[PDB]
Design a binder for these strands. Sequence first.
RNA 1: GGUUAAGCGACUAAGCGUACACGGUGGAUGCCCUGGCAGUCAGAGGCGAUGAAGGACGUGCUAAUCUGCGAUAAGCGUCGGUAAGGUGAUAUGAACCGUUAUAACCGGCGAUUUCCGAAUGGGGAAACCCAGUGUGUUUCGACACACUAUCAUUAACUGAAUCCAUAGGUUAAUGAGGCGAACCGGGGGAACUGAAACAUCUAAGUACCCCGAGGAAAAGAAAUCAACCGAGAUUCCCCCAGUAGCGGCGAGCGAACGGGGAGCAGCCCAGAGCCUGAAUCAGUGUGUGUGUUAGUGGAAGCGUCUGGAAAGGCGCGCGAUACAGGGUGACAGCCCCGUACACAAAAAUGCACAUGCUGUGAGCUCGAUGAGUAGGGCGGGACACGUGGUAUCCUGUCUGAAUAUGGGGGGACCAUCCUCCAAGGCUAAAUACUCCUGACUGACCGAUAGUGAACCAGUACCGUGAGGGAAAGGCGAAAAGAACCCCGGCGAGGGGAGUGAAAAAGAACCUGAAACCGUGUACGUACAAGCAGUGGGAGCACGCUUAGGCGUGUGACUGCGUACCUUUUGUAUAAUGGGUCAGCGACUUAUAUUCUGUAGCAAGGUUAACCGAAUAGGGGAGCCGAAGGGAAACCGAGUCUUAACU
RNA 2: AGGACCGAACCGACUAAUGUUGAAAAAUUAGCGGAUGACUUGUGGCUGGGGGUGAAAGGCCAAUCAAACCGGGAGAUAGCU
RNA 3: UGUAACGGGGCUAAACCAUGCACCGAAGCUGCGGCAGCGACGCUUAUGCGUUGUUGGGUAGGGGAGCGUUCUGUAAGCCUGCGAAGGUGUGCUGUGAGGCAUGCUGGAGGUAUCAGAAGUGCGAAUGCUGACAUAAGUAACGAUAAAGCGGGUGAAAAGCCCGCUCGCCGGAAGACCAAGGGUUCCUGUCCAACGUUAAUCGGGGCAGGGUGAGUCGACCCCUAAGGCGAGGCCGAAAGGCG
RNA 4: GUUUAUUAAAAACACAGCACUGUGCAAACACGAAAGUGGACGUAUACGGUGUGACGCCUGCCCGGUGCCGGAAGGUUAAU
RNA 5: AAUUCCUUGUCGGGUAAGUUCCGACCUGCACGAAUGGCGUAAUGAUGGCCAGGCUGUCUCCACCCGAGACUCAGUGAAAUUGAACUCGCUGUGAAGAUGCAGUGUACCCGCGGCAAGACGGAAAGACCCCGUGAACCUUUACUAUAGCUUGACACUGAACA
RNA 6: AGCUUGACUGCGAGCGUGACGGCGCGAGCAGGUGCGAAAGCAGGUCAUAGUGAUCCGGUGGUUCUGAAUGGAAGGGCCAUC
Lengths: 5, 117, 150
Amino acid sequence: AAPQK
Amino acid sequence: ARVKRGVIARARHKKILKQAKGYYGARSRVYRVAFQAVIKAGQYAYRDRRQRKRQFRQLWIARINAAARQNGISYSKFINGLKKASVEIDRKILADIAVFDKVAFTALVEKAKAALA
Amino acid sequence: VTGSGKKPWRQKGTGRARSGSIKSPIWRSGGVTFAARPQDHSQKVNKKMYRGALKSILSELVRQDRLIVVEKFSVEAPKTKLLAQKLKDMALEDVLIITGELDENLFLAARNLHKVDVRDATGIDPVSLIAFDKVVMTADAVKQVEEMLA
RNA sequence: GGUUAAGCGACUAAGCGUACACGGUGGAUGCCCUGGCAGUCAGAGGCGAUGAAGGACGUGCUAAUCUGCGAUAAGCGUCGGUAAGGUGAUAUGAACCGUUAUAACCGGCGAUUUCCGAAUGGGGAAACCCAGUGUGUUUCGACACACUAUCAUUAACUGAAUCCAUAGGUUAAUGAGGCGAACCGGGGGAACUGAAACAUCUAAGUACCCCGAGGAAAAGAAAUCAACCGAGAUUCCCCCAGUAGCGGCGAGCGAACGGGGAGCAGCCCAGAGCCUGAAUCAGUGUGUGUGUUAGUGGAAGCGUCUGGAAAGGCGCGCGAUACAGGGUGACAGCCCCGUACACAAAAAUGCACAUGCUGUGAGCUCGAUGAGUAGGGCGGGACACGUGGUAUCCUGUCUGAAUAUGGGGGGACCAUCCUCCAAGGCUAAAUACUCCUGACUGACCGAUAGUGAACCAGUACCGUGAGGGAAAGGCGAAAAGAACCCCGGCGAGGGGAGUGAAAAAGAACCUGAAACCGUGUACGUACAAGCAGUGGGAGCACGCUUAGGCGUGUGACUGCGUACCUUUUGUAUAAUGGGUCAGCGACUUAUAUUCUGUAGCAAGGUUAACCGAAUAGGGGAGCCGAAGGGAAACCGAGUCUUAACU
RNA sequence: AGGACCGAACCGACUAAUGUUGAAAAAUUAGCGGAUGACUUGUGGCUGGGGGUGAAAGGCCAAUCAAACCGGGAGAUAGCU
RNA sequence: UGUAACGGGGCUAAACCAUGCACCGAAGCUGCGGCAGCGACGCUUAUGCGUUGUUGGGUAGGGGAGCGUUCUGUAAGCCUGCGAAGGUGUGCUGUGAGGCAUGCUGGAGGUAUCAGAAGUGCGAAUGCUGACAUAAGUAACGAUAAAGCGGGUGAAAAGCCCGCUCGCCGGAAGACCAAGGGUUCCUGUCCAACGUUAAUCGGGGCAGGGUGAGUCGACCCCUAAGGCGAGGCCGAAAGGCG
RNA sequence: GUUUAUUAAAAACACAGCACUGUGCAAACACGAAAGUGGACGUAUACGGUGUGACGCCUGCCCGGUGCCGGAAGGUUAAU
RNA sequence: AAUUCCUUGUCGGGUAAGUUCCGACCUGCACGAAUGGCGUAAUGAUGGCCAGGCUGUCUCCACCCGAGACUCAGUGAAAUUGAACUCGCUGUGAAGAUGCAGUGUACCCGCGGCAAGACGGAAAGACCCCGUGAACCUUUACUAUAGCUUGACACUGAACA
RNA sequence: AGCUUGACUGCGAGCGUGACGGCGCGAGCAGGUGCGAAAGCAGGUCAUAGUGAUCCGGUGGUUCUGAAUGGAAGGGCCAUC
Ligand SMILES: COC(=O)c1c(OC)cc2cc3c(c(O)c2c1C)C(=O)[C@]1(OC)C(=O)C=C(OC)[C@@H](O)[C@]1(O)C3=O
Ligand SMILES: [K+]
Ligand SMILES: [K+]
Ligand SMILES: [K+]
Ligand SMILES: [K+]
Ligand SMILES: [K+]
Ligand SMILES: [K+]
Ligand SMILES: [K+]
Ligand SMILES: [K+]
Ligand SMILES: [K+]
Ligand SMILES: [K+]
Ligand SMILES: [K+]
Ligand SMILES: [K+]
Ligand SMILES: [K+]
Ligand SMILES: [K+]
Ligand SMILES: [K+]
Ligand SMILES: [K+]
Ligand SMILES: [K+]
Ligand SMILES: [K+]
Ligand SMILES: [K+]
Ligand SMILES: [K+]
Ligand SMILES: [K+]
Ligand SMILES: [K+]
Ligand SMILES: [K+]
Ligand SMILES: [K+]
Ligand SMILES: [K+]
Ligand SMILES: [K+]
Ligand SMILES: [K+]
Ligand SMILES: [K+]
Ligand SMILES: [K+]
Ligand SMILES: [K+]
Ligand SMILES: [K+]
Ligand SMILES: [K+]
Ligand SMILES: [K+]
Ligand SMILES: [K+]
Ligand SMILES: [K+]
Ligand SMILES: [Mg+2]
Ligand SMILES: [Mg+2]
Ligand SMILES: [Mg+2]
Ligand SMILES: [Mg+2]
Ligand SMILES: [Mg+2]
Ligand SMILES: [Mg+2]
Ligand SMILES: [Mg+2]
Ligand SMILES: [Mg+2]
Ligand SMILES: [Mg+2]
Ligand SMILES: [Mg+2]
Ligand SMILES: [Mg+2]
Ligand SMILES: [Mg+2]
Ligand SMILES: [Mg+2]
Ligand SMILES: [Mg+2]
Ligand SMILES: [Mg+2]
Ligand SMILES: [Mg+2]
Ligand SMILES: [Mg+2]
Ligand SMILES: [Mg+2]
Ligand SMILES: [Mg+2]
Ligand SMILES: [Mg+2]
Ligand SMILES: [Mg+2]
Ligand SMILES: [Mg+2]
Ligand SMILES: [Mg+2]
Ligand SMILES: [Mg+2]
Ligand SMILES: [Mg+2]
Ligand SMILES: [Mg+2]
Ligand SMILES: [Mg+2]
Ligand SMILES: [Mg+2]
Ligand SMILES: [Mg+2]
Ligand SMILES: [Mg+2]
Ligand SMILES: [Mg+2]
Ligand SMILES: [Mg+2]
Ligand SMILES: [Mg+2]
Ligand SMILES: [Mg+2]
Ligand SMILES: [Mg+2]
Ligand SMILES: [Mg+2]
Ligand SMILES: [Mg+2]
Ligand SMILES: [Mg+2]
Ligand SMILES: [Mg+2]
Ligand SMILES: [Mg+2]
Ligand SMILES: [Mg+2]
Ligand SMILES: [Mg+2]
Ligand SMILES: [Mg+2]
Ligand SMILES: [Mg+2]
Ligand SMILES: [Mg+2]
Ligand SMILES: [Mg+2]
Ligand SMILES: [Mg+2]
Ligand SMILES: [Mg+2]
Ligand SMILES: [Mg+2]
Ligand SMILES: [Mg+2]
Ligand SMILES: [Mg+2]
Ligand SMILES: [Mg+2]
Ligand SMILES: [Mg+2]
Ligand SMILES: [Mg+2]
Ligand SMILES: [Mg+2]
Ligand SMILES: [Mg+2]
Ligand SMILES: [Mg+2]
Ligand SMILES: [Mg+2]
Ligand SMILES: [Mg+2]
Ligand SMILES: [Mg+2]
Ligand SMILES: [Mg+2]
Ligand SMILES: [Mg+2]
Ligand SMILES: [Mg+2]
Ligand SMILES: [Mg+2]
Ligand SMILES: [Mg+2]
Ligand SMILES: [Mg+2]
Ligand SMILES: [Mg+2]
Ligand SMILES: [Mg+2]
Ligand SMILES: [Mg+2]
Ligand SMILES: [Mg+2]
Ligand SMILES: [Mg+2]
Ligand SMILES: [Mg+2]
Ligand SMILES: [Mg+2]
Ligand SMILES: [Mg+2]
Ligand SMILES: [Mg+2]
Ligand SMILES: [Mg+2]
Ligand SMILES: [Mg+2]
Ligand SMILES: [Mg+2]
Ligand SMILES: [Mg+2]
Ligand SMILES: [Mg+2]
Ligand SMILES: [Mg+2]
Ligand SMILES: [Mg+2]
Ligand SMILES: [Mg+2]
Ligand SMILES: [Mg+2]
Ligand SMILES: [Mg+2]
Ligand SMILES: [Mg+2]
Ligand SMILES: [Mg+2]
Ligand SMILES: [Mg+2]
Ligand SMILES: [Mg+2]
Ligand SMILES: [Mg+2]
Ligand SMILES: [Mg+2]
Ligand SMILES: [Mg+2]
Ligand SMILES: [Mg+2]
Ligand SMILES: [Mg+2]
Ligand SMILES: [Mg+2]
Ligand SMILES: [Mg+2]
Ligand SMILES: [Mg+2]
Ligand SMILES: [Mg+2]
């Protein structure tokens, strides 16, 4: 999981 | 019947790696890289059999121009004179005579001048 | 191939090529892609083509002087040594013996001579006629072959 | 000759590159097979309360594991075979047994056969805990042995409410129970998928669950078909035929009649008399033939050369109903084990009979002829047949005949005709399969293949569990498996010595590739900018020589030159994919149909199943073709259209 | 007396830093909340997959949950790479 | 970001216009040699050769012809211990796939020719298995409770043993148990592997030893939640409930 | 008090209290092809469902639409 | 206003200065009465705002104490990787160049540091679109169906009005 | 404006336009008509839009078929919905 564009 | 590939595979790979001798690094050691190198070298070999013919004619002309001007005429006039004189000595020979037989070249130059005069 | 249908790893996220079975033919110990089955290789030959071919072979054996014809060919006892001498006297080897009726003594005597075969006139075949160097036929056998091939 | 100046300039290699020589690592390739795969011909088709399958724990001169066996424990008795050598394997050793018959080994028949497990005396966390009753011993402390589960059927004795009775209870006898690869019959019964979506339909009565049986099962002796002629139970194969039909008339599904074959078998109860126990078949005693379970004999060769070794080369012999196959120091008909062939069973046993005993009852005459059934209404299902005009079969529900002076069927229905007798039952063969046993075969595999397993593999290991599941073969002819010496830690490892044909075959062992890592030698390389090559090319080193010019290696300098695959209008692309090497890895197979090539026959061509001492021959049942037109009747080199054709 | 107050054991998990190929597939350090109750904990039992359980977050049901795992239908299908 | 609007140097022509003659310039065209396709016509074929004309970039894709691998027949033949297959160099040869000879290694197999059948050809599939690189002799060596010295043993001692100091826990980091594990316990011996280093040490390898009950616990008697359940009731079967 | 084990602890969930509604006991209701079991060894001051959410002052108008409750005349309407 | 778009509405308080906060106005885009309205002591690891105290949060950082980093000895990984002989600039170009063109600079090789670039590494984009893909959820979408409910027939009879 | 039903039945040389299914134009033949004295004209409308395949089912006719035979049902063919 990570911040997505 | 089942057919094992090992003997033929080795023979085919070994053929390519023999042509790659002398190439730097993996190009002479590893089949995947050597194959690309061997094919590219073959392309240059095909191409450069044509350039060879161009490069030498370029070289002969330069030497004829140098020797012609020592005798006081430019290449373009020198060649034109020989055509008028009906001399078919080609540029490969003129570049040879220009180096090894300077007195013979001078006679040719005077023959060209007489046709332009 | 023996092995469960369990998927080896999740479809995504592992960074590894996607796979669906351990039994895939791409894998070591996987199945054979087009695995063989027991099968029948026999072919049809038309009766007229079969009989037409035999006539051609027999005509060449004559034309090549390979066909020998005799009145009688028999041996008094099944002793193999007797047949071996008889053929040596004829200077025969690699010979096919065709007889119109089978003397059981002749059959037994030939059985250990691998360069020799004994056949009843009903049992001729295309390959034996071509494979043996000489063919010996009794006059009775010839007539039975003529009636057979018509 | 000296000094100064100017110009030009080799010898450096910390390391690196290319080539070559020699190694390491690693385990490809070749060769091999005591392991697999698919079959053919036979056998067997079960085991269990007389305690199974599968296990636990024991058992040796025995520390472990395997194999066997069970407190009588790698074994005991007896009958046979056989015997000069034996006491299973890793695996030696120790202590012994035996040699003309009581060593061992092989076969039949017996004995022993712990504990768990249907597990059965009760219980239970499998391999454990706890008893009751009755016999017998006793050393008075206790021992040994047998029996005691449940259900069904039958019998005896008991016995309520309830007088009789019945339900119930106790005891005895007989049977079942559980396991197992496929095949078989029945009860239930999906979805993915196809339909280019999807709901009828398909997949499919498939997968799967449950019940029951046998060596096979099921079916079976016309209330059947046919067509005015006739066939004659059931089952299986080839046609008929991808036809007639069914079908959101879509995708698809798909007969029968009739013909050719394999095999061939018919009977009994619904009932009395006559004649009796004649047919036939079940059990079981005996005998003959034959197969099985151990076996016996089983021919014929030496010289010389190479070699570590002869089975090979060369020379001269011999056997053969035996030249199948395997082994022996390299390839053996004659060295060995076998093979062809001829023989053998004390005992048990599968079949064929013959026959004893028990059970059965054959033949004749008269008579009878399967009712909540056939049929119907309603809802479903099976038939190729989806309710359709739908015959026929089954039945959940409600009804309901006639019964040989009668009923069923012939694809809605009616008439005539034909054909057959439902509502009771039994029955071999042709057919399906292979957990398992024996022999033999392969244009099957050969250690990343063949089984998951060539090896102590359903193991190690992983998961709570159901369950998943590996890797791992090769010294040599023979261990002759390296005495002894030296360095070293009374090491690891190594160097000699010795064995051997070989030790660079040394157990980390046949061959031993590539990636990858080194040591040495020749040349290049520290003022030089990029897909690393290509064309030209000096110099150097090493060899050859026609002696100034050839080969191999390197490559200063110089022209040209932005990897490969994929996908795209277009990629150096800064789009995808690949760290490299070695092994594996993707247009197959079966059956129909059409076209082309080629071969045979030709207005004809060809057989399928099957038979066959079997790639032959037989079998022409069928199929395509030589005639078309029409929806069809029908006509026919014509036909349809139309009243008729120009 | 008290779902009373402060605060250890015990139960929890509000903030920050560290760690993030970790000492650890959810921790440590310094602070933090409850702490006689709708408390906490040992042993045993019961509920099962369109089902359970849920002071309700689609949360939990063996490191897995808008339908667990294992085996089978099964080589489902893939006009896509 | 840096001359950055001739490619650069540079140019007063080395710019522009007009005329003219030379020369350079491509895989175009010509010359010389070789190969192959398609036509036409014949030394004459009998299916190939000769003369001549013309053609020969190529993806998707169509058509034609071949090489090589394993296996079956020819083959009880032929080659091979006077050295096969396989591995590794070299030379020759064909248009190519390839073929042939031979030095070294290896140590028992191979197979002509013509036919027959395919598990018949690999660089890619984030392909599968094994081996070996790179990063790199880099990060890290797991609580900041802490060590120092003398003597011993030993091939070798920061780490082992003994001693004296120092430090740390002390509602535990002490002591005894259950659950779980199953020989880790104690003694002798060894240091290959394991121990994040060395090791003489060890919970490591090897051999031997060690667990003693009328009173502790289990077993046993009695029951909870719950389980099973003769008959029974119910359910297509399997089973459910009691 | 409780909650998203593993990024959200809260204003969300629960709560005592309030209202509507169902249930006369072989209760309604739930799990079960069924037997049976829970509700409950309870009995309307009891039990189930729904909404609101201590306490204080309060909770106004609409029955046209959808739902529920009562009615039965007439129209229509299945098997039969 | 947890609701107000225009909107930092307007006015007042607080500050030198206040898009937040508090009070008030009512033009309520689009509050409102048990999917409750309006108050409310106590309580809360609850949201917002202000003040005292305190302070390295900060102006603006300095020094010190330990553990790493650094050197030496022993042991010894991993992500990644077509191959590399792996410079700047301007242009060109699948349109943002270490590799092309022109041009400038540059002896060969380490060690300690920093991260601007290698459209750096990790994950077959989770946003968007597509597929006659999937799942689960809703309803007066379609077709069914468990359950509930109606009637007829059966089990099911007698007499009378 | 008068008289009428050619808004006919069976065919059709030959063309145009569509991938196809299809769509369009048409002289002339046979039968039987209307107008015109006659030659002649008429197979709807100055032309180009006013429309929907197959399946399924309905209605009328018919010299076809009719599951043993004679019928019938059902099917075919023709017109039309
Ligand atoms: C715009 O927003 C984001 O850029 C963003 C993000 O920005 C901080 C953080 C996350 C974090 C996560 C996820 C995100 O999508 C995500 C996104 C999109 C997930 O979907 C998640 O990924 C394992 C998952 O599988 C299931 C979950 O909840 C159902 C999450 O809890 C999850 O576990 C998670 O950690
Ligand atoms: K050097
Ligand atoms: K090695
Ligand atoms: K044993
Ligand atoms: K049974
Ligand atoms: K379906
Ligand atoms: K589809
Ligand atoms: K769909
Ligand atoms: K029917
Ligand atoms: K009937
Ligand atoms: K192997
Ligand atoms: K394997
Ligand atoms: K060797
Ligand atoms: K090597
Ligand atoms: K160059
Ligand atoms: K690619
Ligand atoms: K693209
Ligand atoms: K990309
Ligand atoms: K792409
Ligand atoms: K074909
Ligand atoms: K408790
Ligand atoms: K589920
Ligand atoms: K060789
Ligand atoms: K690859
Ligand atoms: K390294
Ligand atoms: K050591
Ligand atoms: K909280
Ligand atoms: K909540
Ligand atoms: K509220
Ligand atoms: K209303
Ligand atoms: K209302
Ligand atoms: K009303
Ligand atoms: K609002
Ligand atoms: K709070
Ligand atoms: K960077
Ligand atoms: K008119
Ligand atoms: Mg990836
Ligand atoms: Mg395999
Ligand atoms: Mg035949
Ligand atoms: Mg013979
Ligand atoms: Mg050096
Ligand atoms: Mg070097
Ligand atoms: Mg080597
Ligand atoms: Mg029991
Ligand atoms: Mg018992
Ligand atoms: Mg579909
Ligand atoms: Mg079906
Ligand atoms: Mg039977
Ligand atoms: Mg013997
Ligand atoms: Mg012998
Ligand atoms: Mg040998
Ligand atoms: Mg009858
Ligand atoms: Mg009936
Ligand atoms: Mg039906
Ligand atoms: Mg009838
Ligand atoms: Mg009929
Ligand atoms: Mg091998
Ligand atoms: Mg294997
Ligand atoms: Mg397996
Ligand atoms: Mg385990
Ligand atoms: Mg040694
Ligand atoms: Mg020697
Ligand atoms: Mg050997
Ligand atoms: Mg070796
Ligand atoms: Mg230099
Ligand atoms: Mg310079
Ligand atoms: Mg594009
Ligand atoms: Mg380009
Ligand atoms: Mg790229
Ligand atoms: Mg790049
Ligand atoms: Mg790709
Ligand atoms: Mg990549
Ligand atoms: Mg409290
Ligand atoms: Mg919690
Ligand atoms: Mg804490
Ligand atoms: Mg606290
Ligand atoms: Mg508090
Ligand atoms: Mg407290
Ligand atoms: Mg518990
Ligand atoms: Mg939500
Ligand atoms: Mg979980
Ligand atoms: Mg689902
Ligand atoms: Mg399927
Ligand atoms: Mg698949
Ligand atoms: Mg500037
Ligand atoms: Mg220019
Ligand atoms: Mg010129
Ligand atoms: Mg040129
Ligand atoms: Mg040209
Ligand atoms: Mg050309
Ligand atoms: Mg071409
Ligand atoms: Mg061969
Ligand atoms: Mg040799
Ligand atoms: Mg071979
Ligand atoms: Mg060679
Ligand atoms: Mg292949
Ligand atoms: Mg490869
Ligand atoms: Mg490729
Ligand atoms: Mg690595
Ligand atoms: Mg580094
Ligand atoms: Mg460092
Ligand atoms: Mg460090
Ligand atoms: Mg430590
Ligand atoms: Mg010391
Ligand atoms: Mg220490
Ligand atoms: Mg202290
Ligand atoms: Mg131990
Ligand atoms: Mg100890
Ligand atoms: Mg160590
Ligand atoms: Mg130990
Ligand atoms: Mg005592
Ligand atoms: Mg029970
Ligand atoms: Mg709280
Ligand atoms: Mg959370
Ligand atoms: Mg939190
Ligand atoms: Mg609320
Ligand atoms: Mg109200
Ligand atoms: Mg009502
Ligand atoms: Mg203001
Ligand atoms: Mg305000
Ligand atoms: Mg509101
Ligand atoms: Mg309201
Ligand atoms: Mg308020
Ligand atoms: Mg170091
Ligand atoms: Mg480049
Ligand atoms: Mg260029
Ligand atoms: Mg450049
Ligand atoms: Mg650096
Ligand atoms: Mg940094
Ligand atoms: Mg990236
Ligand atoms: Mg994607
Ligand atoms: Mg589409
Ligand atoms: Mg008009
Ligand atoms: Mg009829």
